[PDB]
Amino acid sequence: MERFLLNSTVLLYRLSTVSLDEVSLDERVESSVFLAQYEQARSLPDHVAKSAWSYLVQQIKQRNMKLGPVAILRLIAEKFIKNEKGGPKIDLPMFSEWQTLMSRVSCLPIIACHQVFNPGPASQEYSFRWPLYPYHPTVEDYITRECLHETHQHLNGSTSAEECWLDALKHPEACLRDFEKGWASQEMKQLCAQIDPSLTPRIFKDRLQIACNIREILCRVAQGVELPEWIASMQNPQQLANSTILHNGREYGFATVWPIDDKYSQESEFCWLTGLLEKWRFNAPEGLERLLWIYLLIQNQYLTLLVQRDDMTELREETEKSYLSRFKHAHGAGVYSQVRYLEGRFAPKSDPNKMQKLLFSVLRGYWEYLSAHMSMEWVHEKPLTISQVLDNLELVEPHGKCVELALVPHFIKRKPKNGEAYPHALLFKDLKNQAAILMDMLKSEPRLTGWIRGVDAAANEMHAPPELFCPLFRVLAKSGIAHFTYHVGEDFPHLISGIRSIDDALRFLPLRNGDRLGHCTAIGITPSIWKRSLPLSLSMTKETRLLDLVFIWRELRSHPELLRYASDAAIEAVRLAHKVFSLEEEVSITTLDQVFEMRGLLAESEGLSLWLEEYERARELVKTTGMKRPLKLYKQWLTSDNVRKQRAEYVEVALEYLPDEAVVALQQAVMAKMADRNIAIECPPTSNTRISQYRNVSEHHIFRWMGLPGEAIEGDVPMSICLGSDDPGIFAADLKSEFYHLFVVLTRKFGLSPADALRKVAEVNENGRIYRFHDV
Amino acid sequence: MERFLLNSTVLLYRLSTVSLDEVSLDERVESSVFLAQYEQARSLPDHVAKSAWSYLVQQIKQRNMKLGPVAILRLIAEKFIKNEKGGPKIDLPMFSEWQTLMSRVSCLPIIACHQVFNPGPASQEYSFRWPLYPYHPTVEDYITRECLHETHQHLNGSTSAEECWLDALKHPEACLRDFEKGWASQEMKQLCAQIDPSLTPRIFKDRLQIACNIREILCRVAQGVELPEWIASMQNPQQLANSTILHNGREYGFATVWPIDDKYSQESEFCWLTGLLEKWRFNAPEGLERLLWIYLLIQNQYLTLLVQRDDTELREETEKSYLSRFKHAHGAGVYSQVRYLEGRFAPKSDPNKMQKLLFSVLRGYWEYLSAHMSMEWVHEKPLTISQVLDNLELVEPHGKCVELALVPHFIKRKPKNGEAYPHALLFKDLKNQAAILMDMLKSEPRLTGWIRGVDAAANEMHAPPELFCPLFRVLAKSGIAHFTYHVGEDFPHLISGIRSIDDALRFLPLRNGDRLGHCTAIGITPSIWKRSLPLSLSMTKETRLLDLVFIWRELRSHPELLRYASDAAIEAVRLAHKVFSLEEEVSITTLDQVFEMRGLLAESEGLLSELNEPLKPKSLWLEEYERARELVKTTGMKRPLKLYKQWLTSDNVRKQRAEYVEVALEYLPDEAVVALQQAVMAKMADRNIAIECPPTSNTRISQYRNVSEHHIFRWMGLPGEAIEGDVPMSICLGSDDPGIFAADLKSEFYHLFVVLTRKFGLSPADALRKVAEVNENGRIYRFHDV
């Protein structure tokens, strides 16, 4: 019930608009919590909610406390955080609840509260920069021996969401300008309204402005200095939205003095809270207690919105400090880093000078990380250029202690660009331009090929087909990239359609041995789990359905019992072909394979330097055989106005079109090809609660992949599975935090021995190294 | 049929004598190809063969090229070589075929052809020194964590066989003399005529000289410079046998000047060949096109001859080539791919000869460390044994650089007739050779940390394994501390081969942690061994008698295989009367007692020399001399001893032993032989003695149809290839005589991994572990000091 109290937009409105004069707000905050409880968790019954709230009040009265942020924070910290040998850790059975809490409530205020009301033993040093971890000696020593391995670590933006809130305080207007930049688009308007209907850019500015002023006035209380005498004017929290208050008709700002020169860091914020909370240990003035409550509520609300946004001046805020701290954050406390093989996925920029500076910024950031720990002679102590950084980094050796970086740029996809001789062209033109800078700077600097090891494309799937990037990946391989991963996001309209996308990925993309795929949830989810809450009738594009039906016949023509499904789909496949192609004569399912197999060749090459030979490479291949009919049907499939209109049309498909046994075989058929080509899978963190069908982590699809009893369907083929933390969905996260969650769930929800539980997770973690993109 | 146009005796004959001007040779090469493929692969049917050649013919016509090396390599290059992240590698499904191919064709032209026509990405700097290996992420990362552990490398010679071809070019006169000196012996004469009857020492100089001159001629084309105009007088390749071509009566020559100083280096050949095939990317002049064909045919011919002849140049090749060997073993990258390497070498009688080679290897190893270990040594230029050891004591093993442990291996010889016991001349040499080793080791006692093992790898029928008992035991007191034997690879009968290994186990002073080499006797399934053998084999009486006495030892213990034990004991007594010519009664118990005392030295007092002799002056041998003496005198039983003296020093007995006897092939039933093999396993696993396994790419057994039937899989315990009741052993990894041209331990490691995944159907995670156990057993039983 605690997370409702500290994270509920309605409570922000039912407090900020309420002045500081009255204190009697218990019924209103109770109404706000119950109202917000229904939205965030509908299924929880009212008698459960009403009882659960009252018991919380009883605890507060049992400890002579008042309903407020300083009091609720204690019980949260008391419930989860405990002192261990390493300091403040998380209780092992409570980590599942903590991960759920992390998705909605920031841990920074809680941890300071634990420090104040339960200081660590011997007053040993404790500086907070890293999200808390649970402790288990079976895993801790394994980490010290076998360091962790990352696969998808977004260097773009902030290292974690928690400090981005502080950075937003430093840049009230730059973040707002970026906020209104997307707000004009329809998606952000729905995204903002979905989190909270009462949100406008003007509201956003006032909300951020209130938080900044609240931070200053509470900083004065934390510093112990007396009030600046305009507290008589301090009556309503909405007054602070102007940053200029007047008492007796005189100007009064909110800028104050900070003992630490940097006021926008985790340590500065943590020290601010501990002093403030210590001064409120025995009492709490409500007129000042409320001001803290809005700050916690607004910090939580902004952070919840920011993490969901993932589903100019800000990107270049520091450009040299951002990458250094993240590597230090990856290294963590201690002499030796917990992560050994880290891949930094970064977004390339259209401006060649932007990418070169960004690439220099990352490499220069990496050298600064190695400056403090690895101590040997450096060719240039102040490199300031790419070549000197390579000279600096050419003297390092692989010692399995420091974080080892292997940059992998990831491409971007937008909505399909209709016209231009094929319905996805300007997207190809934009990306082909992006690849041009990558190749020439790689060609200009041969030593760069040891760090730009891979190429990815992770934006979306319905807009751009997976086969679109086959020409782009093949040409990049000839330039020396030497690795190619394709992060297949799972936003598919139908589960069977998702399997088709994976099958297209292995078949069409030039994924050599030892490559990877990202977020392959289509081949993970049990069909019974997927069907939860979906209506019995689903809608998909005719283009998707036609490929889906062709795919089913291709992999179900061998199973004896499941032979009617392939036959029925094939008859329905050719039936839909007549509707789409509008042709009159007979077309066979065998012909449909031939026309759709030519999807690999480029659309421009369909009509027919490294681009020129790649164009002709698929040209002569088109002329090697007698496929004159499927080729022109593919040209019709690409260069016909009626067909494109027919492709975008939506068809209605029943949810239970194929029985559970049919989808499992389709999953296993691709699952077999998944292992046979020996291509690893990148698995997002289990805390990423964006599947929306999982009632809890125990139902996560990864356990089917690993092969625990009761999850691995009979006949399952085992694979190789990696790990990564790109969009954890929680405010503060790390691979170690994700690693412990997997270990905890195995021991609790499945009753596995700690030695065996470690081994199963170790296999997944180890595979992150076996399929690394780093050089040897 | 791409493997018969590059290694074929008749095609070389049918193209060397054909003049360059004429071009019509398809009907002559095709007749040559079928004839050559018949004498190589006799089991290939004609209808498959005729179709296969025609398919190749129309494929070239489809590609619009001209039949020749410039086209044959292209088809192989696009067939086997596939680019990857590590550069040009070999695709996994066709790695096994490549290893079969590599026994006939040198890889160097293929990579040269592949690089020109299918270059790497962005033309990244590529340096080829090592043979191509397939890529597998599950395996390549295992090497990075736990490096390979090699056990049997012959440091005498260079790294692989492909670069030894260049040495044959560098020393045309020396390689001729080595061939001529071998050609004097009958075995090489049979072996040379075995590969090609039309081979004479006069011809061998002719063939090598042609290759050298063709190399010079094509280098001019490769450089792009025009021909020096004496090609007008070029009508036959036989002109290229004299290094002097006359045109219009004016003096000329074939030699030229190369861009690099050392024209006979690995880099020079690659730059020449890649440049040459670069200028023939579209079309090639036929006269020079055939000249390249001759060079490849000659190159493969010498490589084919060299490999077989392996189963002077040595002195010149044994100076600082070890640094290249260690660098070749280290491989590319900062850290070596092989951590524990056991380089064997052949000791020599003269102390100056043996001291010089030992210094060269140790100095060479230090040079390899000095290139990596950029750390200040006590002596910057050692140039002597003592300064090498002082320098080498400063290095620590931290799992990155190659660690060395030299192991001299004795060479057994034919038993010379006479001298009162079988091998006197042989033992006198071995007694002298070890004497030089032991005293020199005592001169510099720090060598006991590097000179770790002793081996003996020449053959099996030449000298019985029990002959090394006295010479090993004294070496044990000399501080060697590790003994390994090369036993069981060659044998006249499978049951007899079992005896030879059990002779090693019972007699040799093998302690826990020692190793054995090529235990093929306990590896081959008896059903597999009987493939394509006559219904009755032949073997010497002495080898037969030791078999019969042994088969009684390990079968009377067997509750159900008693008939074989009882029959053997009966007829062994029958054979003993034939051999010893005795008239009284000798029982099977007496025979075993006689044969258990064959490990004693012949010259031990009271056994062959007079019992009343003055005592020798306290050598390391007096422990051995009197030990075999007192136990013979004691036990109150000298009846077995007097039988043994006739077994050593009787004119009739020694003659009767060498007289051959006829043994049925299936003397023991199929199950019966398995009982002996599982008895060896229990004995040696109890003693915990590892087994060196030969490379599986070595088609020397001539009994396995493919690699999937190799006996190594039986030892590791593969289902469908493990015989019931087998006792699993410890098997280490080694690459001594792979039988192919360009080989390395990493290639052998991949070869094992490929077969498990493909033929046996094992997951990559599970397949690696089985081959990882072999790679780690080379580390558990390492001879390197702690």
Side-chain angles (χ1 to χ4, degrees), chain A residues 398 477-478 483 769-770 772 776, chain B residues 85 121-122 137 140-141 145 335:
Chain A
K478 294 181 182 182
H483 279 91
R769 172 198 74 219
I770 300 190
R772 76 208 207 283
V776 187
Chain B
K85 63 187 70 64
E140 201 277 329
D141 296 312
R145 300 189 282 99
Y335 310 150

Side-chain angles (χ1 to χ4, degrees), chain A residues 167 171 320-323 361:
Chain A
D167 200 2
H171 306 339
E320 299 214 339
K321 184 188 280 144
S322 65
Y323 297 127
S361 74

Side-chain angles (χ1 to χ4, degrees), chain B residues 81-187 189-317 319-341:
Chain B
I81 318 300
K82 283 188 172 58
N83 212 3
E84 266 152 1
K85 63 187 70 64
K89 302 301 209 173
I90 318 177
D91 201 358
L92 282 172
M94 331 178 281
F95 182 44
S96 288
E97 182 65 26
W98 172 273
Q99 289 307 323
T100 291
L101 174 60
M102 271 315 108
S103 65
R104 326 293 292 170
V105 178
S106 74
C107 80
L108 166 69
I110 314 290
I111 296 90
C113 181
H114 159 73
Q115 204 79 15
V116 165
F117 297 98
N118 194 14
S123 174
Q124 63 84 30
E125 181 50 59
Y126 172 70
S127 46
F128 152 70
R129 185 59 162 81
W130 306 267
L132 299 194
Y133 322 109
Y135 194 110
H136 202 106
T138 314
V139 163
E140 201 277 329
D141 296 312
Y142 178 90
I143 281 183
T144 60
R145 300 189 282 99
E146 173 49 273
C147 309
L148 297 196
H149 300 266
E150 202 275 359
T151 49
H152 187 193
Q153 263 203 353
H154 276 260
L155 293 189
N156 304 128
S158 171
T159 77
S160 43
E162 276 178 346
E163 79 263 31
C164 191
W165 159 245
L166 302 190
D167 283 338
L169 280 174
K170 195 178 185 68
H171 308 340
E173 79 162 340
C175 278
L176 167 62
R177 296 195 161 160
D178 284 297
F179 165 71
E180 157 57 29
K181 180 258 297 178
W183 172 271
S185 166
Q186 192 41 246
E187 310 318 306
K189 193 165 283 152
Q190 183 265 329
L191 195 142
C192 295
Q194 178 179 0
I195 282 177
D196 204 0
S198 73
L199 202 81
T200 65
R202 184 65 205 148
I203 278 174
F204 195 49
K205 176 51 87 158
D206 174 14
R207 308 266 280 279
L208 286 173
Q209 187 51 73
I210 291 175
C212 179
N213 294 127
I214 287 180
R215 184 167 189 276
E216 311 291 349
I217 288 181
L218 276 298
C219 175
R220 294 197 182 73
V221 180
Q223 286 269 40
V225 70
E226 287 302 321
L227 276 301
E229 195 262 332
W230 45 247
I231 67 163
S233 284
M234 181 145 298
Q235 280 321 116
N236 214 44
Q238 274 67 15
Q239 285 180 359
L240 321 178
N242 51 36
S243 79
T244 61
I245 190 167
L246 73 165
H247 168 62
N248 288 324
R250 183 178 182 270
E251 69 91 10
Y252 289 108
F254 289 133
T256 176
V257 62
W258 295 71
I260 305 93
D261 291 326
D262 62 358
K263 51 193 285 172
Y264 298 146
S265 84
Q266 185 57 267
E267 290 279 5
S268 71
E269 201 91 358
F270 204 53
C271 178
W272 155 66
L273 203 46
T274 45
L276 169 56
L277 294 187
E278 167 73 80
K279 308 203 173 318
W280 283 349
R281 200 204 289 259
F282 294 112
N283 47 12
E286 194 278 332
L288 310 166
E289 212 285 339
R290 212 184 298 156
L291 278 172
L292 182 64
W293 206 333
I294 302 311
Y295 176 65
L296 274 298
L297 279 180
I298 292 281
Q299 171 179 162
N300 298 354
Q301 274 274 347
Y302 171 73
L303 270 296
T304 294
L305 181 138
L306 182 141
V307 166
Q308 299 292 148
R309 265 194 63 254
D310 208 355
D311 191 78
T312 57
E313 60 179 4
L314 187 64
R315 325 171 300 92
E316 294 150 341
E317 185 177 1
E319 295 195 38
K320 314 331 295 168
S321 83
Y322 308 113
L323 172 58
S324 86
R325 156 85 66 172
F326 294 139
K327 264 182 179 174
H328 174 271
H330 183 115
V334 285
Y335 310 150
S336 60
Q337 91 180 11
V338 165
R339 192 181 159 197
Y340 272 109
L341 156 69

Side-chain angles (χ1 to χ4, degrees), chain B residues 430-472:
Chain B
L430 271 63
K431 183 174 181 175
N432 185 18
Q433 292 177 78
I436 297 300
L437 169 51
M438 64 183 73
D439 64 42
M440 183 293 308
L441 188 143
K442 298 192 160 155
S443 67
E444 289 95 346
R446 278 166 290 144
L447 284 178
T448 196
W450 304 85
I451 299 285
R452 304 287 327 181
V454 175
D455 189 358
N459 214 352
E460 306 326 307
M461 291 75 58
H462 295 347
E466 77 256 11
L467 188 153
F468 285 81
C469 295
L471 196 147
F472 271 26

Side-chain angles (χ1 to χ4, degrees), chain A residues 704-722:
Chain A
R704 174 189 190 171
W705 286 348
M706 301 185 328
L708 271 71
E711 268 79 6
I713 307 305
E714 55 205 58
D716 171 87
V717 60
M719 293 180 183
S720 60
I721 310 101
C722 295

Side-chain angles (χ1 to χ4, degrees), chain A residues 519-538:
Chain A
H519 301 211
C520 275
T521 316
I523 65 170
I525 49 180
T526 299
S528 77
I529 275 168
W530 169 62
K531 300 193 196 256
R532 280 174 187 166
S533 89
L534 278 71
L536 205 43
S537 179
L538 283 72

